[PDB]
Each structure stands twice: as structure tokens, then as C-alpha cells.
RNA sequence: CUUAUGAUUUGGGCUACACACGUGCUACAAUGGACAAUACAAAGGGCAGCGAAACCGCGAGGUCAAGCAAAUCCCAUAAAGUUGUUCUCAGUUCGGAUUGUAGUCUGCAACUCGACUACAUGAAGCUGGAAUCGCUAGUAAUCGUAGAUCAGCAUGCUACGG
RNA sequence: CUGGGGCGGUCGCCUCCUAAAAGGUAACGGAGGCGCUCAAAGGUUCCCUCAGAAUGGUUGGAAAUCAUUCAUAGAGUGUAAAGGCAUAAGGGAGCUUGACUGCGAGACCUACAAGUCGAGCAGGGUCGAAAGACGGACUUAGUGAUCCGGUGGUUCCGCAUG
């Protein structure tokens, strides 16, 4: 036999390691990343209170197409900033989850830098 | 195949594996070569007519492939003709006392 | 990737009717072939390793991974480093191109009657066939290779016990 | 998939006179003379073998 | 010594080998090598043995009769030589050890364990140290031919001439 | 120094134990190390996870290597031991030189000389998409005052002036 790992649990370990010197304090909050296989999820978390400030997703009805799965990630990064232009448009800390800064996690962050966020 | 020039062809084809004094008769049969063909022989249209007769022969290197496995078959059955290869034994029933040196 | 359909035939024609699986996903599936050659202690064979890394590319057309040592065991001359292995993990269609080649040319050139085993498993679904290098270079004959050798082919599947891995090896295999 | 480290391989049509079990590959980069259309349209340079002519087991 | 220390059988062995000394054979060449021609002997043998001239085989050789129990018939065309063409001075056309292919012949039978020839393969070996041996004329040196043993089998032996 | 003295041994730092659950604490008490090493064994960004155990497999030493499943660290961590550590401080890879300059609030330690840790501030960089991380190695040994001398700098002095 051979046991196939799931890609979420390894990701979780990696993310846990990443997210020990990475925190949001509501003057510089944190957006993290959860891409699954179809949809990219972004979310501004203030790590001090444990209270979020914003939320965006590739499966939400405002941004739901079948474009590339990368241009969908560009639409979500455009979405999380224009909701964070309602409040707290200052610097944030990008949290890559446990994923590389490449492809869909990169296009989520390239889109947020060119749409008002200053990270 | 890889024969040398500047010598006579009755001794030149001997230099490859698988020919000794058959080029005097058997290669001389099919090809219309002569005895005094040096490097200056123009054997390029004659290269084709020797290629047809050497293609039937096992000579150029490929005979040593079959010759090697004939010993390998002979030791695998473990015959007395074959044990003498794997053991320095003269093989063809010779006296293995003092004057048996070329097999060591 | 022509004869990959041999597996796609036997998943639903024999394996659904043998064990009576409840879904097509949990049929036993082969995942990797590693062709780990072995050690060949290179006090001199580091030059024969350059032949041994050349022979295994001709068997399977992927470059081997020259696996080095791990410990400092005495009565053996080796340290950390000292590359004493080679393997190729065959994952994709090169597996089936190697599998649907080898199982027709393994039993004939070995000159064995039965040929491999009736059992070689580890109680989990892994075979680990052992080869004394009597099969390879079937295209260019015994012309330029130098030293006799011995391979090792491991078949890693998603079988669960021995008798389900006997079923995958009963497709043009000889136990 | 990496360029540079791989040797050559192709769909080697194993041209055997007994049923032509052409599901093989390797490094037979030789003269392409006759390529069967049901098989690998490449060199037929596997000219003769004892592969699937007479198995010792399924004799 | 006397149910063996004597017998009788086919099967081994006397032929084994990391080696060490005796005795010889063939050599390490261009006063040679390979191919063509062309001479000249002596001695001895032949009680189903020697077996010609023909053939049929690349050859080792097979098929019958020709002669004969032999100064006549056969073994048997001695060879080195001589004549010509060759290679060119290299472990090259020098020699041919050793291994697979012919299955030739003898013999109940050639695996241990024979004898050649057939195409392959072609190794040591460039005239040998200290030492040591033979030999005073048809002798050293070389060249080939015979016979005894023997169904088959000598690089030995014994005789023979050049 | 010394259970008189001599002889033997010892003399500086590091790590334990003795040490009595803070620190500290002696003996010629019990154990050991050091008088370095590294241009990657430093920096930084990325990935990565071990020993061992079975099991079964051309090498098969039991044990090299391959695969599976268990494996909490039992591995490893330049070097003694003790604390550490899978945030990996362990293991790879890519770029690099922060193994920077000027400082340092504060604190530890302590008879003094010494010794240690530092946020932060400029300066000027490296790595990283970025936040950031970088003032040497997982931490704790690898040394020795002053005086004198050498050498290189130096807007300082230099005897009446230069």
C-alpha cells in the first residue's frame, strides 16, 4: 500500500510555522489566504482581538465567473481592498497561508497592491 | 569496416576480426579485385561489392559476441570442457604440469 | 500510453467481480515503480557507477538519483556522501510503457521455468522483484556494456493485503 | 519532463512476427522502415524477440 | 599372506597442479616468409598387409578393381636446393601457442584421455645474465625419409642418406 | 598549595555531580573538556523531516542500498558535558556578506579591575513580493593586564621661527 497525504494538513503545518512571527494588530492588520481547488478566499483578520474586518471569496455572487482561476484571484484581491477602503485602508501584513507566493496566491496579492492597499 | 590502407589487400582484410587468408580466395571470388591493390586502389565502387560478400560473414566483431556466449553456455551447464574455462586450466585435455603456461 | 487500457479493462471486468468492491475508486491501483539498482560498493566502482548510471538510463529513459550513504558502518568502506546507489521512480505513463514491456521480456530471457515467485509480498501490497540483469538493452545487443550487474524492481500499489495485489499481478504476470 | 537530462525514447513498435506485441520503448534510434498504424508510428527496430512467441509458463 | 596381500569384472586413475629442476621440439626471420615452377637420394617395410593409376572431397580422406606374399608391385613426388614473382627491416605476409566451428579415421567405445586439417582466433617471443654442454671431416651444424613397437598415436628411440 | 614537611600531584578557563526544589557554597571530593575550528559550519528567503523497528527485495556481511508501515525526537545539532530545539537551533537549495559604522535607555554580574545582555537611534547595506530579518556559528570554553617595541593612519603637539 501507500498512504496519500492530504494537502490541507501539510499546508496547515506550514501555515502554523509561518504565522508565529506574522500578526495583525488593527493598525497593521492581516489578510490571509485559503485557496482550495476552485475558489480563493481572502480575509482581513485582526489577530489581537481575534476579530475580522473584511472577507472576500471566489464563490461569492459579486465575483463568480469561470475566467482562469487566476483572474478569479485577481477579482478577489480587487474585492478585499475596496471593502477595506471602507475602513482601515492602511498597511496590512500579507499572510500566504501555507502556500507559495506564486500563481493564485500571488495574483491575489498583486491585485491588492494595485487597488489601494499599501503592503 | 575499419581496414588499414597502404598495404596489399590480401593482407589488409586480415586486420579485422574474423578473416585470415580467406581474402585471398573467398573475397577474391565475389569481388573482381587484384593482389597489388595498395592505398591507391580506388576501392569505392569495389567497396560496395565487398560489402555484399562481407554481409554474409559473421566476421567484423559480431563473431566475438557469439564466441563469448558459447563459453558462457558451456560454463552454465558446468561441463568438464566448461569448468576448465572458469578454473588457469588448459581445456582440451592437456598435461597441466610445468609446460602449461599460456593459460596460467 | 497505448496499453494503459489493459488496466482500465481489468478494473471493471475482473476486479469488480472478484472482491465485489462498492465503488470504482477503491480498486487496487499501481502508483510507482522504483528500479533501485542496489549498492555495488564503490571502492573502485565509482567509474563503474558512471557505467551503472548509463545502463539504467537505457532501461528506463530517466536519469537515476545517485543515493549516498547515511551512516559510518565499519567492516565497510563508506562515509556520508560516497554515492552507493541509483534509483528511478516511474510514476506516469512511463510505468506502463515499462511494465507492458518488461513482463513480456522478463520470463523469456531469464531462462527460468516458473520465473519470479508465487509470493514475494510484504503483507501490504508491494512486490520487490529481484533481477540479475539478464533482460536489459533488448535493442542494442551485447556490444559495449562492460560489467555484469543486478537490478531490483519494486512494484508499489494501492492494494491492501497480499491477495488483492495478486489480482493486479495476474494481468499478464506469471506467478 | 526536464530538458537536458533525459535520453531518447519513442513508441518502439516491437515488430515481432508472432502477433507483434508493440507496447515497448527504449533507445533503438535506428532505421525506420515500416510503421504499423495501429502501433507506434516510429522505427520498427525491434526486429526479433522471444517476448510473446512461446511463454515458458503459458506454453 | 590363504573368504585373501590371491581372484573376477566396467568405472576411474597412471594424463591432477600456486609450482621447482632435467631433456628435447618449434621459434624469435628479409643468408628469411608466402606462391608458383623444376631436380637429385639412401635405408627399410608390405602372412587380408602395402594398396597404385582413376575419381569424388577445400583438406584430413572415402569407393572398387591394377598389380604381390616381391632387385620387378606398392608405401614414395624425399626435403633443404635451384628458378621466378613477391612483402620491405615491427610483436608487420615474422610463429600459430590457446580457444569455438569439420565431425576425417582407427577402433564395443575418443567425456575424462587420442591422431590430424577446415575455416576462425591469434598470446609469450627480437637471439637470452651468471654459468654450462656437445663436437677434430663427411664430423659440428642442418634437411627430410624409414623401421621396431602398434587397431589408433613420438617433438622420443633406432637406422638412413642430402 | 599540602591532614607536618619532602616526594608525587596541582595551579587558567568550560561543563556537570556533590549543592540541602532561588542564587551562592569547601575538600589532595566524584566526572570530563579547552589554549580551537568554519568564507559557509555566517546572513537571508524558500522548501524538507529523523533514529530505530518490523516487513521483503538483482548487491545480500547480521547490518550498505530500495520500498511499505509504525515510529516524540530515541536522530541530528564543528568540538567536553549540561541545558536546549521538529517555532526547528536539524537537513537541502537560491541569492548574498550584518563575521556593518557611530552609538546606546536599561539590566545582569561583581571587592576592584574586569565580564555579560540589550530594546532602540542614526548611517549605509544584504535577503525577501512584502511584513520584516540581519552588529557571526543552538547557548555556555578556544586565552594574558600594564609597561616597552614594531607597523599604518592621524585637521594633535612639536621648545625663537619654518
From Swiss-Prot, chain B:
One of its GO terms (molecular function) is rRNA binding. HAMAP family: Ribosomal_uS13. PANTHER family: 30S RIBOSOMAL PROTEIN S13/40S RIBOSOMAL PROTEIN S18 (PTHR10871), SMALL RIBOSOMAL SUBUNIT PROTEIN US13M (PTHR10871:SF1). It comes from the Bacteria. Part of the 30S ribosomal subunit. Forms a loose heterodimer with protein S19. Forms two bridges to the 50S subunit in the 70S ribosome. Located at the top of the head of the 30S subunit, it contacts several helices of the 16S rRNA. In the 70S ribosome it contacts the 23S rRNA (bridge B1a) and protein L5 of the 50S subunit (bridge B1b), connecting the 2 subunits; these bridges are implicated in subunit movement. Contacts the tRNAs in the A and P-sites. Belongs to the universal ribosomal protein uS13 family. GO terms for cellular component: cytosol; small ribosomal subunit. It comes from Staphylococcus aureus (strain bovine RF122 / ET3-1). InterPro entries: Rbsml_uS13_C (IPR027437), Ribosomal_uS13 (IPR001892), Ribosomal_uS13-like_H2TH (IPR010979), Ribosomal_uS13_bac-type (IPR019980), Ribosomal_uS13_CS (IPR018269). The keyword rRNA-binding applies. GO terms for biological process: translation. Gene3D superfamilies: 1.10.8.50, 30s ribosomal protein s13, domain 2. SUPFAM superfamilies: S13-like H2TH domain (SSF46946). Pfam families: Ribosomal_S13. This is Small ribosomal subunit protein uS13. Residues 85-104 are annotated as: Disordered. Keywords: Ribonucleoprotein, Ribosomal protein, RNA-binding, rRNA-binding, tRNA-binding.
UniProtKB/Swiss-Prot annotation, chain C:
GO terms for biological process: translation. It holds the Pfam family Ribosomal_L5_C. It comes from the Bacteria. One of its GO terms (cellular component) is ribosome. Belongs to the universal ribosomal protein uL5 family. Part of the 50S ribosomal subunit; part of the 5S rRNA/L5/L18/L25 subcomplex. Contacts the 5S rRNA and the P site tRNA. Forms a bridge to the 30S subunit in the 70S ribosome. This is Large ribosomal subunit protein uL5. Keywords: Ribonucleoprotein, Ribosomal protein, RNA-binding, rRNA-binding, tRNA-binding. This is one of the proteins that bind and probably mediate the attachment of the 5S RNA into the large ribosomal subunit, where it forms part of the central protuberance. In the 70S ribosome it contacts protein S13 of the 30S subunit (bridge B1b), connecting the 2 subunits; this bridge is implicated in subunit movement. Contacts the P site tRNA; the 5S rRNA and some of its associated proteins might help stabilize positioning of ribosome-bound tRNAs. The keyword Iron-sulfur does not apply. The gene is rplE. InterPro entries: Ribosomal_uL5, Ribosomal_uL5_bac-type, Ribosomal_uL5_C, Ribosomal_uL5_CS, Ribosomal_uL5_dom_sf, Ribosomal_uL5_N. SUPFAM superfamilies: RL5-like. One of its GO terms (molecular function) is rRNA binding. HAMAP family: Ribosomal_uL5_B (MF_01333_B).
UniProtKB/Swiss-Prot annotation, chain D:
GO terms for molecular function: structural constituent of ribosome. One of its GO terms (cellular component) is ribosome. Part of the 50S ribosomal subunit. The keyword Ribosomal protein applies. Keywords: Ribonucleoprotein, Ribosomal protein. One of its GO terms (biological process) is translation. Belongs to the bacterial ribosomal protein bL31 family. Type B subfamily. It comes from the Bacteria. The chain holds residues 1 to 59 of 84 of the full protein. This is Large ribosomal subunit protein bL31B.
Amino acid at each position: 500500500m501507500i498512504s496519500k497525504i492530504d494537502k490541507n494538513k501539510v499546508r496547515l503545518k506550514r501555515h502554523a510555522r509561518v504565522r508565529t512571527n506574522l500578526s495583525g494588530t488593527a493598525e497593521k492588520p492581516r489578510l490571509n489566504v485559503y485557496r482550495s481547488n476552485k475558489h480563493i478566499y481572502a480575509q482581513i483578520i485582526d489577530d489581537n482581538k481575534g476579530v475580522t474586518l473584511a472577507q472576500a471569496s471566489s464563490k461569492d455572487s459579486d465575483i463568480a465567473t469561470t475566467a482562469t482561476k487566476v483572474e478569479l484571484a485577481t477579482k478577489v484581491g480587487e474585492a478585499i481592498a475596496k471593502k477595506a477602503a471602507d475602513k482601515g485602508i492602511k498597511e496590512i501584513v500579507f499572510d500566504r497561508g501555507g502556500y507559495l507566493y506564486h500563481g493564485r496566491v500571488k495574483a491575489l496579492a498583486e491585485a491588492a497592491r494595485e487597488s489601494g492597499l499599501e503592503f | 569496416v575499419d581496414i588499414p590502407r597502404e598495404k596489399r589487400v590480401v593482407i589488409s582484410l586480415t586486420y579485422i576480426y574474423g578473416i585470415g587468408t580467406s581474402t585471398a580466395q573467398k573475397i577474391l571470388e565475389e569481388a573482381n579485385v587484384s593482389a597489388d591493390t595498395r592505398v591507391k586502389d580506388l576501392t569505392d565502387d569495389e567497396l560496395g561489392r565487398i560489402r555484399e560478400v562481407v554481409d554474409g560473414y559473421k566476421v567484423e566483431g559480431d563473431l566475438r559476441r557469439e564466441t563469448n556466449l558459447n563459453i558462457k553456455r558451456l560454463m552454465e551447464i558446468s561441463s568438464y570442457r566448461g569448468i576448465r574455462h572458469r578454473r588457469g586450466l588448459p581445456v582440451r585435455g592437456q598435461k597441466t604440469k610445468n609446460n602449461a603456461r599460456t593459460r596460467k | 500510453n497505448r496499453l494503459k487500457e489493459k488496466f482500465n479493462t481489468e478494473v471493471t471486468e475482473n476486479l469488480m467481480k472478484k472482491f465485489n468492491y462498492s465503488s470504482v475508486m477503491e480498486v487496487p491501483k499501481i502508483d510507482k515503480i522504483v528500479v533501485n539498482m542496489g549498492v555495488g560498493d564503490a571502492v573502485q566502482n565509482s567509474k563503474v557507477l558512471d557505467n551503472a548510471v548509463e545502463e539504467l538510463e537505457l532501461i528506463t529513459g530517466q536519469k537515476p538519483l545517485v543515493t549516498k550513504a547515511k551512516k559510518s558502518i565499519a567492516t565497510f568502506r563508506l562515509r556520508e556522501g560516497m554515492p552507493i546507489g541509483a534509483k528511478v521512480t516511474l510514476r506516469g505513463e512511463r510505468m506502463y510503457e515499462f511494465l507492458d514491456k518488461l513482463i513480456s521480456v522478463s520470463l523469456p530471457r531469464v531462462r527460468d521455468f516458473q520465473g519470479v515467485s508465487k509470493k514475494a509480498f510484504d503483507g501490504r501490497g508491494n512486490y520487490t522483484l529481484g533481477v540479475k540483469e539478464q533482460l536489459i538493452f533488448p535493442e542494442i545487443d551485447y556490444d559495449k556494456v562492460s560489467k555484469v550487474r543486478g537490478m531490483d524492481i519494486v512494484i508499489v500499489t494501492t492494494a491492501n493485503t497480499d491477495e488483492e495485489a495478486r489480482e493486479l499481478l495476474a494481468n499478464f504476470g506469471m506467478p | 519532463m526536464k530538458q537536458g537530462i533525459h535520453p531518447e525514447y519513442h513508441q518502439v513498435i516491437f515488430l515481432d512476427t508472432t502477433t507483434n506485441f508493440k507496447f515497448l520503448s527504449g533507445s533503438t534510434k535506428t532505421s525506420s522502415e515500416m510503421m504499423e498504424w495501429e502501433d507506434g508510428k516510429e522505427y520498427p527496430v525491434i526486429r526479433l524477440d522471444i517476448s510473446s512467441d512461446s511463454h515458458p509458463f503459458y506454453t
